[PDB]
Amino acid sequence: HPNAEDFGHARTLPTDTNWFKHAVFYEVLVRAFYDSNADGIGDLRGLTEKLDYIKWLGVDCLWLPPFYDSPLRDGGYDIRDFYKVLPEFGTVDDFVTLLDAAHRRGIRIITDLVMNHTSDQHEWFQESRHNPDGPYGDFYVWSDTSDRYPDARIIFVDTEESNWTFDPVRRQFYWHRFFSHQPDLNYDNPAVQEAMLDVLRFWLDLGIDGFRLDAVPYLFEREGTNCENLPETHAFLKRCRKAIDDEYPGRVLLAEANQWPADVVAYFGDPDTGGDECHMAFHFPLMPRIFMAVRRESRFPISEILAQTPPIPDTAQWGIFLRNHDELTLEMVTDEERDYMYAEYAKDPRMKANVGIRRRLAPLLENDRNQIELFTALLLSLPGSPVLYYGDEIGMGDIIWLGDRDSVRTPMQWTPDRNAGFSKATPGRLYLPPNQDAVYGYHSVNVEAQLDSSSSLLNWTRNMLAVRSRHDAFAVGTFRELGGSNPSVLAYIREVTRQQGDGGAKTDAVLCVNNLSRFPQPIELNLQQWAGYIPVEMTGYVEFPSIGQLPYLLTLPGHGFYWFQLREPDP
Amino acid sequence: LPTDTNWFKHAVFYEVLVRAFYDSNADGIGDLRGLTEKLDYIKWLGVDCLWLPPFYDSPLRDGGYDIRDFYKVLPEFGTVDDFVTLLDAAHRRGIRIITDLVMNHTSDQHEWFQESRHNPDGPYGDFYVWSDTSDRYPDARIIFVDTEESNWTFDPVRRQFYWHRFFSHQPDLNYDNPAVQEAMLDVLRFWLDLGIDGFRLDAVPYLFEREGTNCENLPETHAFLKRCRKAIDDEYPGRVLLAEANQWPADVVAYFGDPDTGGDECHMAFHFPLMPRIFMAVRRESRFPISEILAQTPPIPDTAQWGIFLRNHDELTLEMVTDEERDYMYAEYAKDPRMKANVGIRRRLAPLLENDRNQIELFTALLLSLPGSPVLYYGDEIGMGDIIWLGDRDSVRTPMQWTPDRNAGFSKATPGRLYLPPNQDAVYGYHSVNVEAQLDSSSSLLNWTRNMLAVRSRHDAFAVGTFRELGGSNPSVLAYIREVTTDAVLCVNNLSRFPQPIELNLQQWAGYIPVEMTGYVEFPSIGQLPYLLTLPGHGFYWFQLREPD
Numbered sequence A: 001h002p003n004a005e006d007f008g009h010a011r012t013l014p015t016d017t018n019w020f021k022h023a024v025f026y027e028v029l030v031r032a033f034y035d036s037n038a039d040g041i042g043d044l045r046g047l048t049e050k051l052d053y054i055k056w057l058g059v060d061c062l063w064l065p066p067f068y069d070s071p072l073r074d075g076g077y078d079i080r081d082f083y084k085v086l087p088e089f090g091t092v093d094d095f096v097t098l099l100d101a102a103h104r105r106g107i108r109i110i111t112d113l114v115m116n117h118t119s120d121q122h123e124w125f126q127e128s129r130h131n132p133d134g135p136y137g138d139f140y141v142w143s144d145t146s147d148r149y150p151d152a153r154i155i156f157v158d159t160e161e162s163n164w165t166f167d168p169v170r171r172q173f174y175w176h177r178f179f180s181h182q183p184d185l186n187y188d189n190p191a192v193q194e195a196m197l198d199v200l201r202f203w204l205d206l207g208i209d210g211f212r213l214d215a216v217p218y219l220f221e222r223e224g225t226n227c228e229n230l231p232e233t234h235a236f237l238k239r240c241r242k243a244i245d246d247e248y249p250g251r252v253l254l255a256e257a258n259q260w261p262a263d264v265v266a267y268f269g270d271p272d273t274g275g276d277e278c279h280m281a282f283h284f285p286l287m288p289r290i291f292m293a294v295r296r297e298s299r300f301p302i303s304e305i306l307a308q309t310p311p312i313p314d315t316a317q318w319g320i321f322l323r324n325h326d327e328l329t330l331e332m333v334t335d336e337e338r339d340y341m342y343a344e345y346a347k348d349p350r351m352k353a354n355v356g357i358r359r360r361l362a363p364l365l366e367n368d369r370n371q372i373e374l375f376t377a378l379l380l381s382l383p384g385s386p387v388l389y390y391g392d393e394i395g396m397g398d399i400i401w402l403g404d405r406d407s408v409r410t411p412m413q414w415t416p417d418r419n420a421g422f423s424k425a426t427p428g429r430l431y432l433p434p435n436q437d438a439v440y441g442y443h444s445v446n447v448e449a450q451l452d453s454s455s456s457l458l459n460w461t462r463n464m465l466a467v468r469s470r471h472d473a474f475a476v477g478t479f480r481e482l483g484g485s486n487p488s489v490l491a492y493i494r495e496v497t498r499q500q501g502d503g504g505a506k507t508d509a510v511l512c513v514n515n516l517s518r519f520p521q522p523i524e525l526n527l528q529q530w531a532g533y534i535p536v537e538m539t540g541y542v543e544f545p546s547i548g549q550l551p552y553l554l555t556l557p558g559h560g561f562y563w564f565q566l567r568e569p570d571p
Numbered sequence B: 001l002p003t004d005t006n007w008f009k010h011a012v013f014y015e016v017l018v019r020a021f022y023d024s025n026a027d028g029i030g031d032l033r034g035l036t037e038k039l040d041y042i043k044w045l046g047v048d049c050l051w052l053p054p055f056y057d058s059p060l061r062d063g064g065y066d067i068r069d070f071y072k073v074l075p076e077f078g079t080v081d082d083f084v085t086l087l088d089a090a091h092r093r094g095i096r097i098i099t100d101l102v103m104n105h106t107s108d109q110h111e112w113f114q115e116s117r118h119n120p121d122g123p124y125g126d127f128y129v130w131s132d133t134s135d136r137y138p139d140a141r142i143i144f145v146d147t148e149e150s151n152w153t154f155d156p157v158r159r160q161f162y163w164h165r166f167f168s169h170q171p172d173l174n175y176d177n178p179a180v181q182e183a184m185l186d187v188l189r190f191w192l193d194l195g196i197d198g199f200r201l202d203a204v205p206y207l208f209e210r211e212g213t214n215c216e217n218l219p220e221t222h223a224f225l226k227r228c229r230k231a232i233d234d235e236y237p238g239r240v241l242l243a244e245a246n247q248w249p250a251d252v253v254a255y256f257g258d259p260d261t262g263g264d265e266c267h268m269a270f271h272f273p274l275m276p277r278i279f280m281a282v283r284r285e286s287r288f289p290i291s292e293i294l295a296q297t298p299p300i301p302d303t304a305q306w307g308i309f310l311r312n313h314d315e316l317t318l319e320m321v322t323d324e325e326r327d328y329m330y331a332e333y334a335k336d337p338r339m340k341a342n343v344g345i346r347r348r349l350a351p352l353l354e355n356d357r358n359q360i361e362l363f364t365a366l367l368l369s370l371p372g373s374p375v376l377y378y379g380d381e382i383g384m385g386d387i388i389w390l391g392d393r394d395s396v397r398t399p400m401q402w403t404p405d406r407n408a409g410f411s412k413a414t415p416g417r418l419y420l421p422p423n424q425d426a427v428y429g430y431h432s433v434n435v436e437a438q439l440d441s442s443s444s445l446l447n448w449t450r451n452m453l454a455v456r457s458r459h460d461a462f463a464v465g466t467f468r469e470l471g472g473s474n475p476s477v478l479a480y481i482r483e484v485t486t487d488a489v490l491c492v493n494n495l496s497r498f499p500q501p502i503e504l505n506l507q508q509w510a511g512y513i514p515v516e517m518t519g520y521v522e523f524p525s526i527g528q529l530p531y532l533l534t535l536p537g538h539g540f541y542w543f544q545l546r547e548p549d
């Protein structure tokens, strides 16, 4: 393994143990964003050059999917070397340069790190199968039979015949929860635990701001269990958090656990220490419920998942995003016993058609601009830290035929020029082609075309992000659902607890009202506790009538929404 | 159709995918009824026989080469009744139909395999090749070496290993079981009874395995092929068997069978190295890669015929044929950046030639005048492009581009429901490349291609004539005569991008008048002095050698 010493490191931002609670994340693939060297493939230097756009957009942290050395048989989630970037993307030094440049603009970077397994091309595995009594002999999970752990499901049931695969060289079976070319690491071997902690430290020494830890529920296996969410798995996660907070204060760990929210709460750790595992975890059912709330023109699927979500440690934060599937497994989270909408998804033909396929926001919503704004408003005002996916801010489409994941991984559309301005290479050499249809194609949909008009989706999104950044209640406020006469309208207030040396718009309460119906709707709200306050609409700053003792009437167009600052009255 | 045991020697074939040609029912997928509705186009183009890749019921994990039921049409294409409708409509127009039939293996979803694994003591227990170990047949290479760790896979239900030369979801049939041989003969008869004109038999070199061998081309494999030919000969005279053997031509001749009988296995087999050699001949501006491959091809039985096509890869395995010992061009392909970029990917003719119309015409002229029965691939006649990102095979399987309308006129469905999207780029997109746009001008690639087919059809020499390479002063020009005995044709082809002169010794035909076949202009009669022909870069001429009064 390389040592971090022989590379540069990035200059660390000032320590801020709460930064991730206030952050808007931007998931961007290195391969897709910008090709600076005309090989048809996006690269680290290209991403570095585009930091000006990212800063202008106003996001706080980049989230990079895996960019490590890999044969790319499973999208790069099959890792061949944890210490090396895929050569086509650049080198470790290019990553340090990117980190420094990002940090200069106050922008942080996290990346995906797959903890559960490596590619079978990883040298640990080649040594494990060729030299069984060597130091890597027990780095993986080996057996003379395929009978162990029978209660564990096969995740990729239509592709893999078993969770055990017979290796022709070692003549024993090895365990894999994912594809056969992704052998599971043996976490019962303390050398494996130390090796993986050393991986985290390598990137942290370089200066990375954190990781999304992938496939963590599957680390340990035990007979008599379904081999997910085991005590020893959480124990290892506590080691990661301990190392993180002791040696690198102010960094973050995000858990990718595609489970019902009550079940992922455990991944934040012990409530009594304030949380001692992951700082963040994703709330996967939110988008499916929002999607269904709109289809149904009813607030309840949204009201319900929020009400039923258990409280989490003070230190912790949910991550939220506008996708219906986990990118690792392409599964939508559900629960037969605890999801009242369990059987309802299969009854919606749009939902049904896209089962197991990642889709971008605009295509999910049939390019309806009003709905894109509504879903985006919800993403930016509901509790949690939001993740925007690259290209959704201009309304990019997808290309489903490229694959279940690759559908959403086509080049960023910068201009209406050749290759959408992503590359100077010949089109036949692009890693994937840009969208070329009349609706989503780069001749029509690109950054340059949207920069001019204040009314473009890009400019609208950038303004919404700016507004959000100026109001703390969106990031760390309480959540109070207001109910109301009309079931088609979701209304809530978010409040800051307010301690010492504050008082201003930044800490004033906020009121959000969202119409899930396609038709204009009235709603009368009981806001009597805020009698005398003045609702000020956030985008145009117009003062609405002061709140009284009577119900407050707001009227919304189809799929419309309003955000108001609740200003304290003048004495 | 009235029996005509030589029809395949005179045929031009047209490989057309049911899924890609025409969607008549607006589900976004091409279908048999749709293909039937486009037969007038196929007749007008002038081809003689359709070649349909597998259209059987299948989970489509390996492009439909993974068959779930040999007796059933994939439901989205229609049913056996739609297939008979297609057959009758084609025959009415004098067009025949052959199809791919995978003989070596089935999908693991096939009911035979599910019975084999669940009920080992039952009648299907020995329908596949099972073993307690993965040690047998170690000399057989793994075809898909980057994907399959072994030719043996452990089945979790039966708890034994089964053999597969292809992907793990394609278990090999056990041809040492006599019931397997009878079941597969019965598949042949089922489609022949419906009226199909023949089959391309796929993966046949791999039927039998034997210890101490590489498990290809075994004598028992050829013995089973003889059973297939005999069944055809005895029960369905006038039908054809084509072999898909991606091997050096010398090795392929075995698939025509015993020369002493006039051939007792396949009627046809493919000459795979032809396109790679033509491609390199043009890259090097030398006739030699073509001259040599033809000269080194052994004689085949007189009732047999080579099939030829303008592709560098076999569609089953995505491999280009070669031979370390017998191919002088063996190390040369890797030195060509065009060949190197496209390794393991099917590409259409226009993209292979960077859309150079002169070269498209040159390669097509060679395809239509060299010895063998040519196969045209659907869409090449209008210059369609491909979409490589769709997959190594799906690259060339996008919808036929009929018009510049929505979905290229292939379907009325919404674009997001199409099985694959049409080309949409500035060069190959359906807004500029489509049948409708080319129908009008006599100078379109489509009308040029149609005219060349019409010309070829009027000269038996192209189909069954002898082949005499004329040599000549200039190594950049390939000249030859095709002759049958009363019909003699002279073909001259410029492999150089620049204009070239060639002086030919045509003394044997002195007095004859060369008549150029497209404009019918009479050229100077052949004398005792060498005949000078001058060609533009990548040009060609076809001449009928007419007897003097």
Ligand SMILES: [Ca+2]
Pocket: A116, A177, A184, A185, A218, A219, A220, A221
């Ligand atoms: Ca594990």
Ligand SMILES: [Ca+2]
Pocket: B104, B165, B172, B173, B206, B207, B208, B209
């Ligand atoms: Ca076999």
Ligand SMILES: [Cl-]
Pocket: A029, A030, A031, A032, A065, A066, A067
């Ligand atoms: Cl990437």
Ligand SMILES: [Cl-]
Pocket: A325, A326, A327, A328
């Ligand atoms: Cl995800």
Ligand SMILES: [Cl-]
Pocket: A323, A324, A325, A357, A358, A359
């Ligand atoms: Cl999704």
Ligand SMILES: [Cl-]
Pocket: B017, B018, B019, B020, B053, B054, B055
């Ligand atoms: Cl098909």
Ligand SMILES: [Cl-]
Pocket: B071, B072, B073, B078, B079, B080, B081
């Ligand atoms: Cl059927």
Ligand SMILES: [Cl-]
Pocket: B313, B314, B315, B316
């Ligand atoms: Cl082929």
Ligand SMILES: [Cl-]
Pocket: B311, B312, B313, B345, B346, B347
């Ligand atoms: Cl090809």
Ligand SMILES: [Mg+2]
Pocket: A034, A035, A036, A037, A038, A039, A040, A041, A042, A043, A088
């Ligand atoms: Mg690049």
Ligand SMILES: [Mg+2]
Pocket: B022, B023, B024, B025, B026, B027, B028, B029, B030, B031, B076
């Ligand atoms: Mg159809």
